[PDB]
């Protein structure tokens with residue numbers, strides 16, 4: 027089982043970590059479009075175009091399956107990606123919704139979706155939740171979280187002001203969907219901001235359960251062999267990857 031993992035840049039490592047630790051695969055190819063990141067503040071057409079180029083890049087690897095780690099790309103490009111690919115392609119949005127339903131199991135509970143501008147604008151989360159009868163939803167772009175995470179700001183007064191700027195006079199949700207690859211890095215601060223009543227829905231953990239229910243995968247004895255590629259400064263991606271996944275252990 028050799029799969030591909032696509033993200034707009036470095037943030038998708040949160041999803042990779044999930045897939046890595048779940049021990050589902052022999053081998054994983056991670057590609058980050060670091061030369062053109064972010065996607066979240068750009069337009070639909072551009073996002074779809076960039077995703078198709080990524081699929082082109084993965085053509086050289088003989089992968090059995092492609093996971094779109096990026097929520098933004100998952101929001102707009104799945105249709106095109108699936109029309110072109112001849113192997114299963116999965117995004118994280120569908121998975122995120124069902125993990126939310128599984129966490130709450132009560133259509134009356136309150137849900138907050140936080141993501142990039144483009145992901146929110148797609149209304150893809152909203153659409154899936156509503157169709158399942160979950161109508162107590164709020165969707166909110168919190169875009170500054172991405173470059174803050176990338177600058178290594180995961181807590182403190184700077185981040186507090188960021189949350190208060192985004193979360194002023196909004197209600198505390200029974201669940202918040204971390205609908206952005208970067209957001210698990212802010213998991214503790216977010217949870218501290220909202221309190222323990224709010225369940226955090228993690229996209230990476232979500233896609234893992236999603237695959238386990240959809241596929242028949244034996245749990246591996248050994249960790250997958252990881253491969254890192256990037257459109258720019260691949261060593262920087264690898265450096266970040268080493269820190270976030272801790273690829274320095276035994």
Ligand SMILES: N[C@H](CCC(=O)O)C(=O)O
Nearest residue numbers: 034064065066097098207
């Ligand atoms: N990877 C993107 C966040 C960074 C970007 O804007 O490209 C996402 O999950 O939505």
Ligand SMILES: [Ca+2]
Nearest residue numbers: 108109111112
């Ligand atoms: Ca197909």
Ligand SMILES: [Cl-]
Nearest residue numbers: 101102103104
């Ligand atoms: Cl889509």
